[model samples]
Structures are given as C-alpha cells and as structure tokens.
Target: KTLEVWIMPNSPQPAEDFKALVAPFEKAHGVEVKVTVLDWGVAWTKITTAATSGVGPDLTQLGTTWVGAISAMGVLEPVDDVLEALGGEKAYLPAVWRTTRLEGARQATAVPWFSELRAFYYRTDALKAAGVNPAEMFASWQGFEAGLARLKASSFRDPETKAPLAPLCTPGRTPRTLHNAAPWIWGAGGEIVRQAGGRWQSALNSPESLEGLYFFLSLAQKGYVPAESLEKNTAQIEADFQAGKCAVFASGPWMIQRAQVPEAKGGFAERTAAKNLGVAPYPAGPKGRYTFFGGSNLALFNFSKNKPLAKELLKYLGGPEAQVRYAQMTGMLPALRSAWSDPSFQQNPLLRTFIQAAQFGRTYPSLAGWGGVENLAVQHLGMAWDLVAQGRLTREALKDLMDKASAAINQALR
Candidate 1:
C-alpha cells in the first residue's frame, strides 16, 4: 500500500524535494509514497473539501494559521501521545509548538514541520549612497520612517531606469496584505484576536492596533511608497525589488534563494541587488519589536486508510534529518530546534539573523474562527490601505472603518 501526502509549492520544487525527503521513510517501511504539490491559491479550498469529505491524502501540509479552521472541521487525528515521545515542547520552537493545538484544548491537530519569519530587505548600496546607516535607521518605527525619507531625498538612481528609486515597496491589495501588516500590529502591542469571557473576539480595533495600522498604511500616504505599488501584489513587488525599482522591501529567506547564485553560472553574481541585499529586523514599535511567526504543519487526516504507516512517516518528517534537508532545500527555517545543529546551517549567513529573529516571533491567537476574521481583515483592511494610499484616511476615519470591521468579525464569531 502507498501513503498519500500533499505539500505546497514552498520549495523551489516541492515535488522533487518530497521524493528525496520521503525516500528514507519509503525504504524503511517498504512502501511507496505518492506526493502532490499544490499551489497556494487552490490548496485551501482543496484541503477544506478534503476535510469535509474525509477522503483526501493520508497526510498534508497546512499553513500554521490554517490549522485552526481545518481542525475545527473534526477531520484531523490527534497526535498527543506521540508528540510527547518525539520531545514535545522542548524539541520544537516554542511559538511554533504553542500553536499546534487550539486554544483551551489538550490535543494537537497537527505538528509544526517548519517555520517562517519576515524582515525588511534593503539595498545596501542605496543606503551607502544616501549616507544612511541601516542598523540605526531600522532600529525603531520612527527611525525607519525618517531613514526612508532620507533615502527618498537622496540622489540615488535606479540602475535600470535612470529615474530615482522609490524608498519602499509593499503590496497593499494582495493576498499578503494581512500577513504583511501583522508584524506592525504585533510590534505595537496589539492583537488580532483575544479571549474574553471564555471566548474569542476581534482585538483588531484596539487603539494600539489602529496605531500600527496607521503607520503601515500611511507609508504610501507619506509619499515614500509609490502609488502604483499600492495596487500591486507581493510577486510584483518582489519583481520590482529585483529590478531596483525600490530601495527597500520586506520579504523572507526565499528571496535570497531566488537572487543568490554563483557567478560562473550566468546568475546574479554581478548584480547590485544580489551582492548588497541586506536583511533588517522589523523595526521596533513603541511597545516592542516583533514579526509574524508561522509556517506549515504536517497533519494526519482521520479518515486515512494507512494511519499506522502514515504516523511513522509524520514522525520521520518532523525529525532532525528530514527537517534539515527540507530547510536547506527550501530556505525555510526548521521547526525542530535540533535540526539547526547541522554544520551547513551554522555557516549560512542568510539563515543567521532569521534564526535569531524567530526568538521574538509572535503568532495570531489560534482559534477555529480565525479564518473568517482574517478574511474580513483582508476586505476591511484593504479598505484602509486604499484610503490611505489615496490620501483619504484620517485618524477618526480609520477608527470608524475598524469599528465596522471589528463588528463584522464579531458578528461572524457569534
């Protein structure tokens, strides 16, 4: 019999990587493993359908934030006992482990397989030309604003187009809109959800959350982030970053994988962006510094016919050897703390700061209803982004919009 598995297009080629990664398990158990790599756009709906039908792959990868919604459907198998045997909390990243179970629940629906964090990537050459120091420039929220303003004021030219480069780039209308805003919201000491009177509710309208929202949205309003960028998606922004259209942008480790290549291979060895790309920790807010902490989890479907064999594959996949290979292949940080001990991981500068930043990572409250709240945030928060980009958002106006957004989420919760 074969064990069926599903994964996302996280790695450069997840299908190929999965084949090699799953080889050990296949050989050890003498069973073939069939894997499918799903695109992010369709993965959610497919997983949701599979959850309800109870006839999908034996195991699949769920985004860290997605566990809540799928688990609530009651199709996931409990992994509690073996989790303890696999080193439990101490072996995995604390923030990652803490999210494996729903709030107020004793059993975990899934186990963290890897982790992701976001930080700003800046043009080192551009900063030098502007006489700006990134270390001090990105130290605080105010400092980042001031620093980018200084970059905008400088005479740095886009290598591709002689025009001056924009100081920043971010997707205001993309699927990443909410995920991009999460760090700022967290840094301001605000939350998207909170437990009140034994239930979850939206905390997105809190004064502190609004403050962070204002800061993020006002980036385009302040004239530092371009108007056209407000209409683009994260992919477009990344393309712009690669082409030197912006002096600074935010992305994760995978960007490095996309840009870095040896000179002899006709790759980015001579490119300014590739050679001088610098990753800066998310700027600190008045309350503290933080970033979105999330990745994928390996979940077992309750209806899987090959549960006994599948569980062993899950353990191996979540173990150090398998995790190390996946991390190296995907540039995603490993969920297993022990996996970092690999000699290759120790020497890579790309993973160094990201690993450090993971120490202060934060995640949204894991709840069954979080998917609805997050979807609402995209619609309502995009409203704020568009308004701010168009020079229409104001303190009072933002409050009103969020008030409505929060109410809508609360209605869904009830």
Candidate 2:
C-alpha cells in the first residue's frame, strides 16, 4: 500500500529531495510513499477544497498561520499522541513549539517541521558605494531612512529596466503585504488583534498601530519604494532585488540558497545579486526590532486511513536527524533544538543569524477567524497603500482608513 503526502513547493528541489529523505521510512515500513508538490499560489484553495470534501492526504505540509483555520474545520488530526511517542513537547524549541497549539485547544494539532523569519538582505557593493554601514545606519528608524536617502542620492539604476531604483523591495499586494506589515505593527507596540475580557477586538486603529502603518506606507509615499510595488508580491520583490532593481529587500533564510542559483531557476546567481547579498536584522522602529515569523509544519488529516503508520512517519520526519538534514537540503531553519546541537550545522554564519532571530520572532494571531481577518485586512490595507503610492492620499488620512477597516474586521469576527 502507498501513503500520500501533499506539500507546498517551498524548496527548489522539494520533490526530489523529500523523496530521498523518506526512502528510509518507506523501506522500513514496507509501504510506498507518494509525495505531491502543490503550487504555493493556490495551495490554500486546494488544501481547503480537499479538506471540505473529506479527501485530505494521509500526511501534509501546512503553514503555521493557516493551522488554526484548517483545524477549526475539523479536518486535521491532533498530534498529541504522536508527540508523546516522539518523547514529548520537550523535544522542540519552546518558541516554535507554542505555535502548534490552536487557540482553546488542549493539544497541538501539528508538529513544527521547519521554520523561517524575515531579515533585510542588502547588496554589500551597493552599500559600500553609498557609504552606508548597515549595522549603524539601520539601528533606528531615523537612521534607516537616512541610509535610504543616501542610496537614492547615489546614481543607482536598475540594471535591466533602466528605471530609477528603489532603496527597499517590500510586498504591497493582498495576502503578500500582510507579512511585511506585521513587523511594523509589532515594532510600534501594536498588534493586528487582541483579546479583551475573553473577546477578540481589532487593534488596527490603535494609536500605536496607526503610527506603524503611517511609517510603513510613508516609504511608498516618499517614493523610497517602487511605485509598482503596490501590485507586486513577495516573489516579485525577490526578483527586483535579484535584478539589482533595489539595494535592499526583506526575505527569509532560503534566500541564501536562492542567491546562489540563476534567477531563471528561482535564484539570483547570473546577475551576481546572490554573491553580493548580505543579511541583517530588519531595522528597528520607534518601539523595537521585529520580523514576521513563519514556517511550515507536518500534519496528519482526520481522514487518514493509516493513522498508526502515518503517526510513525510523522515522528520520523520530526526527529532531530530529519530536521537537520532537511535544513541542509531546503535552506529552511530547523524547528528542533537538537538540530542546532550539530557542530557542522552551527558552522554556517547565515544559519546562526536565523537561529538568533528565531529566538525573538513573532507570529500572527492563530484563532479561528484570524485568517478571514487577515484577508480583509490585506484588501483594506492594500487599497490605502495604493492611494499613498499614487500620491492620492495624505498620511493623516491613513488613520481614518485604518479605523474603517478595523470596524469591518471587528464585525467579521463577531
């Protein structure tokens, strides 16, 4: 018999790499394994469609942010017994481990498999030419703006498009913009939503949140970011950076691997963008430094016919050896503390940077209605950002826009 697993196309060689990793398990269990890689662009729709029909795969990969909503649909199998079989919750990183539990649930529905967090990748040559010291210049919001100003003053032009270059590349489209927006809100001591008296309330209109929103949109308003950015997604942002259309951009650890390949192959090697790439913590805001904490998980569905065998496979994948090997093959950060215990793994400086940032990372609210709130928030925020990008909205008008969106979001959650 064969066990099926659905996964997002997160790695450059996910199908080939993952198949090899699971070969041992397949041989040991005497069952063939089928791995399917889905397009990330429509992974959510496909996942939900399958779940709604009670036809989910035996094992699957899920985004940490989407776990709550999917679990609420009762399509996910809880992994409590699996965790116990794997030596309990103490086996994982405390921070990453906490996200596995859905709100109001006693046991985690998923196991932390691999993870990622945002960091600013800059062109070392470009920064040097602009006379910018990324460490000192990006220490605070003011200093960061000054560095952008300096880069703009230099004769920086996009090598391919011949258009004037942007200092930073960030997403502004629906869904994609939300990841980039989280850090600003958190750094300003604000949140997307919070619980009060056992009720969830929108925090987008809070003074602190508004402050962050203004500062975030102001980059587009001031023309420091690309005008087309209002419609660009995260992948486009990465492409722009790779093409030298921008000097700096926010991305995850996999970028280190992507940087080494040709852009046509989902890398930046041909342009030498990868070679010149240097990463730093996302610059600090008035409140503090923050980044979007995100990652993928291994989950079992309620419809799995082989729960016991599936449970064993899940445990094998989540083990320290598997975690460390996956990180090496996929360029993702490992979720197991024991993976970090390997001397060879600790030798990579970029990996060290990611591990340090993971310790202080943050994630979006993981409640039932949070996904709906995120989609609506993205729609509302994207509209406001477009207005700002086109010079049609004043910074002062942003608060009102947020207030309206907040009200709509609050109503949706009710």
Candidate 3:
C-alpha cells in the first residue's frame, strides 16, 4: 500500500524530516509513502482546491478549526468510532485534543497531534540589570505590565545606536493580532463569541474584552514599545530580540530552538547573548491564564481509496511513538499525553514552560463558521492597533471596530 501525506512546510522542517520520521510506520505497516510539501498559503489553496476537485491525497493534514466546515460538506470521514482501536482521546492533552471536536461532541473528524502555547521571550541580562525578575512577572499579566513599566523607566539603551532598550513588536493583521492577543483578552475575562440554542452572539463589545483591547494598545500609549512596533511581524521582532535591541517579545515553544541558536562566537553573538533568552507562560490575567491552543489534525478524506489503511496511518501518526518522533524531528510537542513521559521532554527545561502553560490553555470557539469569527476578531484588533499607533483611532473608535467585527463574526454562530 502507498500513502500520500500533505503538510505545511514553511518552517525549517519539511518533507525530508517528515519522511524519515514516518519511515518506521511504513516498514511496520508495509506501505510506501509519498510526501508533499506546500507553503502555508499554498497548502490552504491545495487543500480547499482538492476538496472541490475530489482529487486530494489519502490522509491529509487538516486544521482542527476546519473540521466542521469540511465535515458539514461531507468531505471528511468520522474518526470517533475508530478512536478505541487507535487509543482514546485521553492520550492527548485535554485542551489540545478538544480542538479535534466539532460543536461540542468529539466525532473525531480530526485526530489530535502536537500542541503549542505562546510564552514570553526576554533578555535575561537586561531584565536583571533593570532589577526585574522575569520569573516573578511570568506568574501574572498585570505584574508583567508593571514590569514593562519599570523597563521603560530604566536607563538602558542600545549601546551602538543609542536608541531605546525596549522595542516591542507585533503583527499588523487584525486576525493575527487577535490570535496572539486573545490570550490577554480571554485571560482578562473577555470573550469574542458565545453560543446558545444554536445561536452565536458578539461579545467583543463586552466591557471585559474591551478592557483587554485597550490594555493591548496601551503598550504604545505608555511608551513601553516603539510606535513602529505595530508594523513588525514575529520574525522581524525575533531578529530584533536576537540582536539584543528588544527586551521582550511573545512567541510559542516552537520558537525556543531558533532563540537558542548558538550565536557565532566573538561576533554579534557575544554582544547580543541571544542565548540569554528566557521562556515563561503568559502571565495570569484577572480571570486566569488562557493561552491559545492549536495543532495539525489528521483526517482521512471520505473519498480516499484506502480508508482502512489510511486509518492505520492516522493511528500511527497519533500513536505514542510516531507522535514523539514528529515532535523531536521538528520542534512540535508530541500530542499524546503518554509520550510526555519521554526523558527528552520530562527533562528539557524550556519545554517545561509549555507544559505549564498547557495546564491553563483553552481553544477558541468551535462553531461551523467559527473560523470566520476568529479571522475577523483578529483583524479588528489589528485595525485598532494600527489606528492607535497612527494616533487616528481612539478608545471609542476602537470599540466601534470591535462592534463591527463582532457583528460580522456573529454570523458564523448563527
């Protein structure tokens, strides 16, 4: 039997790593494998296009968020009935595996895989010089903001360029910002949507969520971040942090490896001390610390010629051994909880940051049109951030954008 797997390959890991990781499965199952790599943008195009054309691969890597949209269209095979044979959902982190469920019931159109949660990144030396302990701040968001205030008031500046020390950066898209910023929003007791009797309503205008949005923009208003940071992406900020120009940034476990890359000796490496990188879970908010949870979900398309065999591949991918292999080969954390006991993760200090965060993590809403709501929520926040950065959008105007975006998002719930 030959099986084809399609995956998103924008990162350093690609087909080569995945192929080698799954080689054991091939041998055990006696199946040949074909691996296809696609850029994130192209991957979305290929999957959606293939769904319409009825010519996609056997076991496609689908996002848990899309399980409902595609499943409603009758394109996915329900995997819930097959869970007992593979292993129960209890094998995964309760939060990460929940993403695989649609509309509350875990029909298992999508099988859970690796889990990741965003953690704050900072320059340990600078923070120490500023008389701040990051570990203390990691425990709470309000405390973290207070620490940011202290850093802003500190006398530190880039030695060569003589610029400010703290140059916080964030993405410009409304949706992306929401995805990254939602933890703060939700952590502060704010929510974007709520469902009742098969109806969805916009909660972006709620006082709590609005407080989160204002606090988000306050990063610039309070002088904790450069005005230009509103335009920067994760990679750009990552570079800035690497150069020791920024004091802190937000990213997930997957980024720990890149941050830990040994700086070339005797060069910017020594001066930057990129190795000074520190990781911590998002600070707890008024309600609780709620980090965003996401991962690749394995699905067997209903139209595949090898349904039974593909189920086996899904099982292998979801199994303890293969999940651990994928996590190690790439930086993705294994999905199966049983694999977490592996010495590599049980002992790795940085990974412990993610493990702790996962304890309080929660997924966004999972309605049939919930994807649209998330994109719109994030986009609205981006607009609010941009307006504030340009001195054009006010708290009132920001609220308007939230309302408008919320109304658009509410349609998905309806």
Between which residue pairs do clashes occur in model 2?
Answer: none
TM-score of each: 0.95, 0.95, 0.91
Q: Give the TM-score of candidate 3.
A: 0.91
Instruction: For residues 1-414, write the lDDT of model 1, one tens digit per residue.
Output: 789999998766679878988898898899999999899888999999899877799999999888988888889899875577679988887778877887667789897788888988889889999988898888999899989889989998867567787899988773643778888888888888778797777888899999998888887899988998888888789878877788999887777765665435323445668877888889889899998888899999999999898889888888888888888777788888888778776677766777777777888777888888898878888888778777998978888888888999999998
* TM-score for predicted model 2 compared with the true structure: 0.95
CA deviation > 4 Å runs, candidate 1: 174-177, 261-271
Report the lDDT tens digits of candidate 2 across residue range 271-335: 74666778788777878888888888888888889888888899988888888888877788777
Question: 1 or 3: which has the higher TM-score?
Answer: 1
Q: State the C-alpha lDDT per candidate.
A: 0.83, 0.80, 0.72
Give the worst 10-residue stretch by lDDT in candidate 3: 260-269
Q: Which stretches of candidate 3 lie over 4 Å from their true place?
A: 104-106, 155-164, 260-273
152: Cα error in model 1, Å: 0.6
Kindly report which residue pairs in candidate 1 clash with one another.
Answer: none
- The true-structure Cα RMSD of candidate 3 reads 3.0
